[PDB]
Amino acid sequence: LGEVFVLDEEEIRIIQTEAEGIGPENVLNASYSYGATFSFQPYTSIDEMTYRHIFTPVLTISSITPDMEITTIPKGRYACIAYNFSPEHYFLNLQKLIKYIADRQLTVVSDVYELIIPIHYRVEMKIRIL
Amino acid sequence: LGEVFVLDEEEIRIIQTEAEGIGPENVLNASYSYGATFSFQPYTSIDEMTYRHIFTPVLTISSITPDMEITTIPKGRYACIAYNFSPEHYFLNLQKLIKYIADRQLTVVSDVYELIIPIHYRVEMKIRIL
Ligand SMILES: c1ccc([P+](c2ccccc2)(c2ccccc2)c2ccccc2)cc1
Ligand SMILES: c1ccc([P+](c2ccccc2)(c2ccccc2)c2ccccc2)cc1
Numbered sequence: 001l002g003e004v005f006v007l008d009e010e011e012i013r014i015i016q017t018e019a020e021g022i023g024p025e026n027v028l029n030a031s032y033s034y035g036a037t038f039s040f041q042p043y044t045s046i047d048e049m050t051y052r053h054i055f056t057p058v059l060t061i062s063s064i065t066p067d068m069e070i071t072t073i074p075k076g077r078y079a080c081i082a083y084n085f086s087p088e089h090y091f092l093n094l095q096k097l098i099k100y101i102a103d104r105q106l107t108v109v110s111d112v113y114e115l116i117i118p119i120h121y122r123v124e125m126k127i128r129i130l
Numbered sequence: 131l132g133e134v135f136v137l138d139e140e141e142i143r144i145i146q147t148e149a150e151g152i153g154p155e156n157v158l159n160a161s162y163s164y165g166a167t168f169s170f171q172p173y174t175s176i177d178e179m180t181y182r183h184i185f186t187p188v189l190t191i192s193s194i195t196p197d198m199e200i201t202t203i204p205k206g207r208y209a210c211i212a213y214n215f216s217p218e219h220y221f222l223n224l225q226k227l228i229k230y231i232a233d234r235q236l237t238v239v240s241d242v243y244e245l246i247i248p249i250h251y252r253v254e255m256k257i258r259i260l
C-alpha cells in the first residue's frame with residue numbers, strides 16, 4: 001500500500017480518445033474514473049511527461065463515434081503501484097516504478113497506465129511486463 | 131478464402147504511432163508487414179474512411195521513443211476475412227464484414243484491424259467480437 005507489486009490482472013475494456021498533447025502538468029494548473037497513458041520513458045519532469053491517450057472504462061451493443069476507440073487493458077502481468085493522490089507523490093511514485101523496473105531488469109511491454117478513481121481520489125500506475 | 135470466418139486468435143505484440151489523418155485513399159494515389167486501424171463505422175466511401183493508428187509487429191528489452199507505443203492485438207475472438215490485394219476488393223471486402231456483423235447481430239469490441247503482408251500483397255481485416 002504505497003509500494004510496488006506484481007500481479008496477473010484481468011482485461012478491462014475501456015474507451016479512448018487522444019490527449020492533444022495536454023500534459024500532467026497542464027492538468028494541475030489554470031482555473032476551469034478515467035485514466036490516461038504515456039511512454040515508459042526514463043522520465044525527469046512533469047514538464048517532460050506528456051499524456052498520449054485519455055480514457056474511461058466501460059460500464060455498458062454500441063455507444064460511440066470514430067473519434068473514440070473501443071479497446072481494453074490487456075490481461076497480463078503488470079508491475080503495479082497504488083497511492084492516495086497528492087502532487088508531491090505523483091512524480092515521486094513514478095520514480096519508484098521506473099526504479100523497480102531497472103532494478104529487477106524486467107522488460108516492459110506497454111505504455112504506463114494511470115488510473116484515477118474519485119474516492120469521494122485513489123490512483124495507480126501499472127505497466128505491462130513479462 | 132475470400133469470405134469471413136470466426137476464430138480465437140493469439141495476441142500479437144506490435145508497435146505503433148499515429149495516422150495523422152492520412153486515409154486509405156490517400157495511400158492509393160500520388161507519386162512517392164504492417165497494418166493500420168480505424169473506427170468500425172457503418173462506412174460508405176474510402177473518402178470517408180480515415181486511418182487512426184499505423185503499425186508494425188514485433189520481431190525483437192527495448193527499442194523505442196515516446197512517439198511510439200509498445201502494445202499488441204489482444205488475444206480474443208475476431209471475425210476475420212482474408213483477400214489477395216486489389217482495390218475494387220478493398221472496399222468491397224469491408225462491406226461483407228460489416229454486413230456479416232449486422233446479420234449475425236454480434237457485438238464488436240475494437241477498431242478494425244488492417245493487416246498487409248507483402249507476399250513478394252496479402253491482406254486481412256479482423257475485428258474483435260464477443
Ligand atoms: C483533457 C481533458 C480532461 C482530462 P482529465 C484527466 C487528467 C489526468 C489524467 C487522466 C485524465 C481531468 C482530471 C482532473 C481534473 C480535470 C480534468 C479527465 C477526462 C475525462 C474524464 C475524467 C477526467 C485530461 C485531459
Ligand atoms: C503513412 C505512411 C505510410 C503508410 P503505409 C500503410 C498504408 C495503409 C495501411 C497501413 C500502412 C504504406 C503502404 C503502402 C505504400 C506506401 C505506404 C506503411 C507504413 C509503415 C510500414 C509499412 C507501410 C501509411 C500512412
Ligand SMILES: [Mn+2]
Pocket residue numbers: 018052053148183
Ligand atoms: Mn492514438
